[PDB]
Design a protein around this ligand. Structure first.
Ligand SMILES: CCCCCCCCCCCCCC(=O)OC[C@H](COP(=O)([O-])OCC[N+](C)(C)C)OC(=O)CCCCCCCCCCCCC
Ligand SMILES: *C/C=C(C)/C=C/C=C(C)/C=C/C1=C(C)CCCC1(C)C
Ligand SMILES: CCCCCCCCO[C@@H]1O[C@H](CO)[C@@H](O)[C@H](O)[C@H]1O
Length: 227
């Protein structure tokens, strides 16, 4: 009939909006140039989330895809958000540990794949191929999560305990939250259609807010971002 997911779009909008504005204000107040690069990335992550939630709320970034004999709604704008915001989040982790330039290029890379395949999955009309795309995307994601868990922690260990242990909290936050997205896609409106669209918007919304504003509040309050 109508669109019951709207409420969680509206609450996502509110939350990314407040977070964007809060980061903007704290970021403008501080003088340290190193701390600033973190503000700039993190305020930008939130701002993009905000604009994409707000579009969706207003009914944009939505398409119908036929698969399994039905006409099925898919919010593709969501992938336009992730395309930019996930790699910016990795750049935050990467600058915290002084990652080598070519590790960063690998992650951004893996990441582009992850979002690009997720999206193609979300629009494929042969039901089983949707899961082929989904599996590739999850493979790229695991690769990310591996490098953050093995490669970056080893890097963090070269840093003062305070930047290491901030990194550890953020790594920990990223691993738990990111590792849930594939499960939601698989069981929700984009995959098996078990969990309906409203409940799935809710879940992604909570993961997104946690993965960006939650992440942001942890980083941007740390002494670790100061030079
Ligand atoms: C240097 C010179 C360059 C030459 C010209 C090229 C410039 C083009 C830029 C990139 C092209 C993207 C096109 C686009 O369209 O973007 C993506 C999308 C909108 O989706 P859709 O329209 O197909 O949805 C369904 C369709 N149906 C609802 C209307 C029926 O959603 C989004 O990522 C964002 C939506 C808007 C963001 C909200 C904040 C500010 C918006 C103000 C302007 C809006 C004016 C109408
Ligand atoms: C602010 C948004 C965040 C941190 C979003 C993270 C999203 C992912 C790690 C997405 C992962 C996906 C898969 C692993 C496979 C299927 C489709 C994707 C895009 C949802
Ligand atoms: C109310 C919503 C507006 C959000 C403003 C987000 C600001 C994004 O961040 C911007 O990144 C620049 C690089 O281009 C940095 O060097 C800056 O400090 C900043 O202008």
């Amino acid at each position: 009939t109508g669109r019951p997911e709207w409420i969680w779009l509206a609450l996502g909008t509110a939350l990314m909006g407040l977070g964007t504005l809060y980061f903007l204000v704290k970021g403008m107040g501080v003088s340290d140039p190193d701390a600033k690069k973190f503000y700039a990335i993190t305020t930008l992550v939130a701002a993009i989330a905000f604009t994409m939630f707000l579009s969706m709320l207003l009914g944009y970034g939505l398409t119908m895809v036929p698969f399994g004999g039905e006409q099925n709604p898919i919010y593709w704008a969501r992938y336009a958000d992730w395309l930019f915001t996930t790699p910016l989040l990795l750049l935050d982790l990467a600058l915290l540990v002084d990652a080598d330039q070519g590790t960063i290029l690998a992650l951004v890379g893996a990441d582009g794949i992850m979002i690009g395949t997720g999206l193609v999955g979300a629009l494929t009309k042969v039901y089983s191929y949707r899961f082929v795309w989904w599996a590739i995307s999850t493979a790229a994601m695991l690769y990310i999560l591996y490098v953050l868990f093995f490669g970056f922690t080893s890097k963090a260990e070269s840093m003062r305990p305070e930047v290491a242990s901030t990194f550890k909290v953020l790594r920990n936050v990223t691993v738990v939250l990111w590792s849930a997205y594939p499960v939601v896609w698989l069981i929700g409106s984009e995959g098996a259609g078990i969990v309906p669209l409203n409940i799935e918007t809710l879940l992604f919304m909570v993961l997104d807010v946690s993965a960006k504003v939650g992440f942001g509040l942890i980083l941007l309050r740390s002494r670790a971002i100061f030079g």
